[PDB]
Ligand binder design. Structure first.
Ligand SMILES: Oc1ccc(/C=C/c2cc(O)cc(O)c2)cc1
Ligand SMILES: [Mg+2]
Length: 735
């Protein structure tokens, strides 16, 4: 009957370790012992299993695979766990906690498509890069109300636990999913949403499934405009997002809210070789009707500068035409009128035409526009005067004191201004899409919420710019948040309760890297960038000179390379990254000629006019004598997010990428181990084994299962499996 106890169910077939045979049983009852060793001293992440054949008071002697005998100190020995542990669902149960042992367990499970594994109090998820039938409604129904220890590891399980904690403690919760680019953060986020929507959805009729349905449909919309193919992930999220799933006092979903972060606007006008622009561009050109393509003056992606420079217009296994159908159905369900949808595609189309405008040098240094085909097509779909747009692009007016001076930009500046317009149009459209979605989703004051964080993951490319710094900085802060909660706060609690705990230094601390980036006193990188950003004579060169001056040979996480004069390295928790300074000032200032804004404010299109008239979308905090910079704006939004997260009970999911080829069944030890190390996975397990997880105040420990407030002799007979703090009683591991 009960699926979890029926070895024939899909639950058992796809979520539990397969039954071993009599031969494995023989090996499982063996008295022989083993160690994980490095056949090649250089490759410390490549292990083999060797049998221990002898030992001394302080060393082991084992046989290698080839046959030679090696000796090693017992203090430096990585013993292999009894194979009965191979596949264990919670690695905190492992007898030997060492790198090769932890990797091996994950490998055994991975080899039989068990991608989820507990690592103490948090979940580990290794990307399978293939479909596994463990997310059906049947699967959802099984974890409902189950205790973590009662069911197999699963993203649904941690989701249910956060949900039960929210109701039992009446405290907001948060699901923080970490991982480098392509690790699986977005897929797992969708699953947390799917699970919450179902488990706490309105179990009534179609209507009672409208909200929940609009919640799930918000994703396809955002991904179509916010995701793109990069060299690390075919569906890379180019924006971060904190999703608030709201519940009423009864525990029913009452709504949801989405906060988007740092959209990579630059991708609209530039893409590295083999990458793509945002999905939506390809979806429109491939899935639009002949009518629409005529009205929008559309054509093949190869006919557009913004889509024909990477050498890639399609993704293997993806039908852009079919995806366009999915995107449109999601807009319908969410609530985008047909008039609004057309305006949206007009903007997308307009952007493409703007990209085809070719500026040329005129008689003098000023640029001219010989062929006006693209300019006119763009103006047509946007609903603006082409004559005004042309002038705003090549001859924008600015102030020179108080005097009004018409400029005449050369080819390079005209092209940049046109790109600025494009990026502003895309960025504002995205914010608008998010805004519209939220108004529909937010229809009542929440009583509680479970926040799901899904940011752009840690990434390194051949060329890393300001966008990568912001992305990696964010990932660095998320890691410190894990370190803060798993180690710092945990031990501080022991210290305050005085339960005879000697402080342990786990060696995980990204504060130095974080300060190097966002520090104010002394000023970090972002601070010096802002300073240069308002200095009238600053250049990309003065900026990097400034950076080297403040940090070269002075900050341990910074490096001035000897092989370049335009790059600087930052040692992140996930590895050192070299950043190219080109365009940082312009990207931080994020300029846009006012004449361009004036031109579009007069747009005949309802959507376009709102992108330039709505102050919440078109206005910019002019805090000071200058507009707030991207750096100051983002640093601010991030500090706000972190403050919010601190008011919740956090649940961590560490996504792990198996390799860098987006291939299934190919778990690479070096790639996986690097992530396990920088994520602090083993340290997190150790703190859980050597620590005291649960703890309750004495006075309020009167059998939640007399009343004097002393936990007095409430000894329910182990003196080692607990302690007594100044105001609480702690517990070793199992209750
Ligand atoms: O099954 C698979 C599906 C997709 C891929 C991605 C390949 C790929 C293609 C590129 O142009 C650049 C890149 O960095 C990676 C690999 C395996
Ligand atoms: Mg993602």
């Amino acid at each position: 009957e009960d699926p979890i106890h029926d070895r024939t169910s899909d639950y058992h077939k796809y979520l539990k370790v397969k039954q071993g045979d009599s031969d494995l049983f023989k090996l499982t009852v063996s008295d022989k012992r083993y160690i994980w060793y490095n056949p090649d001293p250089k490759e410390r992440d490549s292990y083999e299993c060797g049998e221990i054949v002898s030992e001394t008071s302080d060393s082991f002697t084992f046989k290698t695979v080839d046959g030679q005998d090696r000796q090693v100190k017992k203090d430096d020995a990585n013993q292999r766990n009894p194979i009965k542990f191979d596949g264990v669902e919670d690695m905190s149960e492992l007898s030997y906690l060492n790198e090769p042992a932890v990797f091996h367990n994950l490998r055994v499970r991975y080899n039989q498509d068990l991608i989820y594994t507990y690592s103490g109090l948090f979940l580990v998820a290794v990307n399978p890069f293939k479909r596994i039938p463990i997310y059906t409604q049947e699967m959802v129904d099984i974890f409902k109300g189950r205790r973590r220890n009662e069911v197999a590891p699963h993203i649904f399980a941690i989701s249910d636990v956060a949900y039960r904690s929210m109701l039992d403690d009446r405290q907001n919760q948060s699901l923080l999913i970490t991982g480098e680019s392509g690790a699986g953060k977005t897929e797992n986020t969708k699953k947390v949403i799917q699970y919450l929507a179902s488990v706490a959805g309105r179990n009534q009729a179609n209507g009672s499934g409208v909200l929940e349905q609009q919640i799930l449909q918000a994703n396809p919309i955002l991904e179509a405009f916010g995701n793109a193919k990069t060299t690390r992930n075919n569906n890379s999220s180019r924006f971060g997002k904190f999703i608030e799933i709201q519940f009423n006092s009864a525990g029913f979903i009452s709504g949801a809210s989405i906060q988007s972060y740092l959209l990579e606007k630059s991708r609209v006008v530039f893409q590295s070789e083999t990458e793509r622009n945002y999905h939506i561009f390809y979806q429109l050109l491939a899935g639009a009707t002949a009518e629409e393509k005529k009205a929008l003056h559309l054509a093949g992606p190869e006919s557009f500068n913004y889509l024909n420079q990477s050498g890639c217009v399609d993704i293997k296994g993806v039908s852009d035409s079919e995806e366009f159908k999915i995107t449109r159905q999601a807009m319908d369900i969410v609530g985008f009128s047909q008039e609004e949808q057309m305006s949206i595609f007009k903007i997308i189309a307009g952007i493409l035409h703007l990209g085809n405008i070719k500026f040329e040098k005129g008689a003098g240094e000023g640029a001219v526009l010989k062929d006006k085909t693209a300019l006119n097509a763009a103006s047509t779909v946007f609903g603006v005067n082409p004559s005004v747009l042309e002038k705003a692009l090549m001859e924008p007016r600015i102030l020179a004191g108080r005097d009004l001076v018409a400029q005449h930009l050369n080819v390079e500046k005209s092209s940049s201004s046109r790109d600025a317009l494009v990026k502003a149009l895309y960025g504002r459209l995205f914010l608008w899409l998010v805004k519209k979605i939220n108004n529909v989703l937010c229809q009542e004051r929440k009583a509680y919420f479970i926040g799901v964080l899904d940011i752009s993951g840690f990434e390194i490319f051949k060329v890393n710019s300001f966008e990568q710094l912001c992305i990696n900085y964010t990932n660095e802060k998320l890691q410190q948040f894990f370190n803060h909660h798993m180690f710092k706060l945990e031990q501080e609690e022991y210290l305050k309760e005085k339960i005879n705990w000697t402080f342990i230094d786990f060696g995980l601390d990204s504060q130095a890297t974080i300060d190097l980036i966002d520090g104010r006193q002394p000023p970090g990188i972002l601070a010096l960038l802002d300073e240069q950003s308002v200095f009238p004579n600053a250049t990309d060169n003065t900026l990097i000179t400034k950076l080297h001056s403040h940090f070269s040979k002075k900050n341990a996480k910074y490096e001035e390379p000897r092989f370049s004069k335009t790059e600087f390295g930052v040692t992140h928790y996930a590895g050192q990254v070299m950043y190219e300074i080109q365009d940082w000032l312009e990207k931080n200032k994020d300029p846009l000629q006012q004449d361009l804004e004036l031109c579009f404010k007069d747009s005949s299109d309802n959507v376009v006019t709102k992108l330039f008239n709505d102050p919440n979308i078109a206005s910019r905090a002019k805090k000071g004598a200058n507009f707030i910079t991207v750096a100051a704006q983002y640093k601010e939004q991030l500090a706000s997010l972190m403050a919010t997260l601190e008011t919740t009970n956090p649940h961590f999911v560490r996504c792990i990428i198996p390799n860098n080829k987006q291939l299934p069944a190919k778990l690479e030890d070096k790639v996986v181990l690097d992530q396990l190390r920088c994520n602090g996975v083993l340290e997190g397990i150790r703190i859980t084994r050597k620590g005291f997880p649960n703890r309750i105040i004495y006075a309020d420990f009167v059998k939640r299962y007399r009343d004097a407030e002393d936990s007095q002799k409430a000894t329910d007979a182990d003196p080692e499996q607990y302690r007594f703090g100044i105001t609480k009683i702690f517990f070793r591991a199992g209750q």
